[PDB]
Amino acid sequence: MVDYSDCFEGISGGAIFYNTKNKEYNIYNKELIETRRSPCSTFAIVSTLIGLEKGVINSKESVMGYDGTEYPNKNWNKNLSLEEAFKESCVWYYKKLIDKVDAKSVQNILDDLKYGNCDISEWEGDLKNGKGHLNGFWLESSLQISPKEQVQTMAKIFEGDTNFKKEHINILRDIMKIDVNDKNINVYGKTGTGFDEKNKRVDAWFVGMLEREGDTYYFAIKSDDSNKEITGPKVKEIAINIIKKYYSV
Ligand SMILES: [Cl-]
């Protein structure tokens, strides 16, 4: 077990890195890394592949059709492409996408990916939050997955061990790339932000992979802090600092 607590600056959380080469896990906070939680918008990694496999989308430019709804997040207020929906965590785009897939197809794909509890029973999500259609089974609802299960899922997808087409995985890699001000390393990832009302803790995520020289690491960074200021973007900042201090040369 490793200690990346310095990069969390007192925020409650954990981190797990996996190298498919030597099959070794680098684990900070084992109990937290093994606890299942809602994936929130990190589910966009898998929903993007489901949409491509089923022909609901076909490229980084694919649009889903904007109905003119004025959302609080003004970055959602247009007919945005797959790459923009991924980067802006656009829930309306991904709900309209998954609504065009039979639950049985989603169930079979999650079961084959071993995506945590694979529970999509609350399809429409938790309507008790008053958000209406801005909800889904992957947003503080029935679907739950641990940080370790996220990295096991990432490894199977990007090492070619799933049924997804390599062409579709390459589209996902492209939209997952993030700029970290260091051409020597390639970082890919998706943020997730939610609040677990029952337990009064955030679900703040940054899930992805690091490609450095001759090594690839699949990673999941997670916070369960009490402070609602702790969001996916903040956990992404922590992830980049962990990568800079413990995964550089
Ligand atoms: Cl360490």
Automatic annotation (TrEMBL):
What name does the UniProt record give this protein? Answer: Beta-lactamase
Q: Which family does it belong to?
A: Belongs to the class-D beta-lactamase family.
Question: Catalytic activity, per the record?
Answer: a beta-lactam + H2O = a substituted beta-amino acid
Provide the E.C. number(s) assigned to this enzyme. 3.5.2.6
Keywords, A to Z, come to: Antibiotic resistance, Hydrolase, Signal
Keyword Transferase appears in the UniProt entry = no
List each copy of the Penicillin-binding protein transpeptidase domain by range.
21-243
Q: Which residues form the active site?
A: S41
Q: Name one GO molecular function term.
A: penicillin binding
Species name:
Clostridioides difficile (strain 630)
Annotated Gene Ontology cellular components are: plasma membrane
Q: Which residues carry this modification: N6-carboxylysine?
A: A44
Q: What domain of life is recorded for the organism?
A: Bacteria
What's an example Gene Ontology biological process for this entry?
Answer: antibiotic catabolic process
